[PDB]
């Protein structure tokens with residue numbers, strides 16, 4: 001009944017993606033809360049939520065880095081209340097890079113170590129998200145059925 005959507009986005013790709021997802025969940029009857037990573041703090045962030053969706057863009061010149069706003073959260077993921085919590089991940093990227101949506105893997109690896117429960121494989125979007133719109137909607141739909 002309650003979902004938290006936390007996103008880290010620079011050029012607004014991931015932000016558009018997060019809000020598409022939320023419409024999908026709010027439509028199915030969930031109570032939704034969307035938050036910019038810049039605005040939140042890690043201590044008990046997952047408290048009171050049945051499902052969490054975390055999205056981030058991928059950066060870095062010579063190594064894989066997470067979006068700036070997300071870093072603090074990622075760093076203190078141990079304090080969010082992730083053990084046994086149902087999560088799913090997403091992000092925007094560019095397949096011209098070697099590690100296509102490398103942030104997604106990093107987060108997912110981190111969550112499993114914490115004992116989170118990963119409901120579905122992460123959504124990884126190439127180029128412009130409005131052109132992968134049906135894919136976003138498809139995923140939200142799948143996420144829903146995997147609960």
Ligand SMILES: Cc1cc2nc3c(=O)[nH]c(=O)nc-3n(C[C@H](O)[C@H](O)[C@H](O)COP(=O)(O)O)c2cc1C
Pocket residue numbers: 008009010011012013014015056057058059060061064067092093094095097098099100101102127
């Ligand atoms: C210097 C740089 C490095 C990037 N590195 C990667 C990468 O390793 N893997 C990937 O999929 N995308 C990579 N991308 C691209 C972004 O993630 C992409 O432009 C994305 O749509 C931005 O998402 P946002 O608006 O949510 O910030 C990089 C972009 C730049 C400028």
